[PDB]
């Protein structure tokens, strides 16, 4: 394959992802590329499984030399994205964390927040069930 339009360090992976997501929502665009990270891979896999986001492909040049991820949004056959709003939570200027018992259901009890904890990254419901809390990466609904 050929993954085009690489992005360098903007100021962080989270805002680099958010700007691409909102630009894809704006221009009705299908697939966009951003930086690669263990947290980004975890949240992207969990969003593929959650249904808000479509698949993704993580690519490398040879090593840490360049690691990116291309990601597509799930679209019905009407150019309607499955993403109805995603908000980044983990930020450089503000490191946000919440306990397992203080995680809400987004949308109307439907939206799923992505939460990394002391021992892994998971969804809000199973984060509450795990009895282990930590940082929040993205509120997705």
């Amino acid at each position: 394959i050929t993954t085009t339009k690489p992005i360098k360090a903007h100021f962080d992976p989270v805002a680099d992802l958010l700007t691409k997501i909102n630009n894809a929502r704006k221009a009705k665009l299908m697939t966009v590329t951003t930086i690669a990270s263990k947290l980004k891979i975890a949240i992207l896999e969990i969003l593929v499984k959650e249904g808000y986001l479509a698949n993704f492909q993580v690519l490398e040049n040879k090593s840490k030399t360049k690691r990116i991820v291309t990601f597509n949004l799930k679209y019905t056959q009407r150019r309607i994205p499955s993403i109805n709003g995603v908000k980044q939570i983990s930020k450089p200027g503000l490191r946000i964390y919440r306990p397992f018992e203080k995680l809400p259901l987004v949308l109307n009890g439907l939206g799923i927040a992505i939460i990394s904890t002391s021992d892994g990254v998971m969804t809000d419901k199973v984060a509450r069930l795990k009895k282990i809390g930590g940082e929040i990466l993205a509120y997705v609904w």
């Binding site: 697939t31 593929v48 479509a54 698949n55 492909q57 799930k74 679209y75 056959q77 009407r78």
Partner: peptide, 23 residues
């Protein structure tokens, strides 16, 4: 250069389609 193809399927060709049966 391919590292991992998480569900390599990608949606494409969103035709203008709605209420396909009206007869």
């Amino acid at each position: 250069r391919t590292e991992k193809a998480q569900k390599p399927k990608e949606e494409l060709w969103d035709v203008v389609q709605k209420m396909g049966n009206f007869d």
